Subunit: 153 residues, 3 copies
């Protein structure tokens, strides 16, 4: 039927003094993202609004708007996607971070995302990459996330 | 039915004495893209050629005329365009007031209704060449179907 | 009707003294990609996109970083696991970003390798090449990046 695709990007700086929260999971580390600055949840939200052609995360959830962590935002995104007429079919994503090791936390992130989107676990995927010591990502100065989402009207 | 996906990437340097044109919209700014170097339309063009497996922009070829030709070639290969999504990564200037016009431009060029075309914008949080405003990146995804 | 999408990203450093192998093609060049396998950045990105579309995690889960491993053999194994999970591949698209060397003379060969490894006809596989317009570590030729997207159906 009426399938649509969306894609999402996000990046935040990595500094001492903030906790590291990615995909709703708090990961012990000497440093955290500046923004809860959940780079993975933001990229996924963008991908979803994109698939539904609803603009972007900033247009829905403004820095200034009096009307929240990134999971609340993800859930509101999904309701808006639903109300627009679209059912979510799957999400895939990649986190690019030189450190720390993310593999142990992947199932936790998938579980949070699946819960927030009301999806079966087998329709949510999260992957992790280093940047092979290249650029600001490779130097541990920031963390990037990429997302793809498929929906149907 | 026979769906296919494509993905596109483009980046251009920001330089003095060039108009800034993105998604076919002229945006007032001290610099512009070097190449009309419309990074957004180029990424979308590559995503569409990718979905139709027709190669890339460099193997085929202003950017709106090129986007129209791309759409022509896609249809010539037997595909219909179902939707486009995209992200512009620019530290500056503010793109928000220009986005709906970009969507309208793309929709017109692809012969698509507005609700099948999306454009999003992000800064780079002051990181890398994007963060320093040395260039602007675009990413695109397209879904087509062979009927 | 049960379609799924996946996306993939990879980057490797370019160093002297290594073969340059992208899309399974050995490309004449004074530097090659550094990695534990043959460091084929394009095949790895595609492999990740396919595992991602099937929700089977990532290339590191399946093939733990394989010393000098042929990344085409890895791609074929990935395709096998994707099929075993119940998915057929419908198409792959990809972009390589590199300052140098010129990739255009090798693109059709890369496409042919990928099609062979995924048992797809050529018309469902696409490879695009881009410079990074002189920007950043890619612009300085310090590494090569690949991006991929895949559509599958269960
Ligand atoms: N150069 C930019 C970057 C981002 N935005 C908008 O500002 C928000 C902040 I991420 C998003 O809604 C985005 O659309 C913008 O208007 N101009
Ligand atoms: N390293 C590169 C980068 C780009 N190109 C080709 O040159 C054109 C110019 I963007 C594109 O079509 C692309 O296929 C190439 O042959 N080698
Ligand atoms: N920050 C990171 C980066 C990567 N990995 C895992 O390590 C492998 C080496 I690229 C990746 O494919 C992924 O499986 C990880 O656990 N944490
Ligand atoms: Cl370059
Ligand atoms: K990038
Ligand atoms: Zn964010
Ligand atoms: Zn361009
Ligand atoms: Zn690799």
């Amino acid at each position: 039927m009426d399938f649509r695709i969306g894609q999402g990007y996000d990046v935040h700086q990595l500094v001492p003094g903030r906790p590291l929260i990615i995909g709703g999971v708090t990961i012990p580390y000497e440093r955290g993202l500046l923004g809860d600055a959940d780079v993975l949840l933001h990229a996924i939200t963008d991908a979803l609004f994109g698939a539904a052609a609803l603009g972007d995360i900033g247009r829905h959830f403004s820095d200034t708007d009096p009307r929240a962590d990134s999971r609340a935002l993800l859930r509101e995104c999904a309701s808006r996607v639903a109300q627009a007429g679209f059912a979510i079919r799957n999400v895939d994503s990649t986190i690019i971070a030189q450190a720390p090791k993310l593999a142990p936390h992947i199932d936790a992130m998938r579980a949070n995302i699946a819960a927030d989107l009301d999806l079966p676990l087998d329709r949510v995927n999260v992957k992790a990459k280093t940047n092979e010591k290249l650029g600001y990502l490779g130097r541990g100065e920031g963390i990037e996330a990429q997302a793809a989402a498929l929906v149907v009207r």
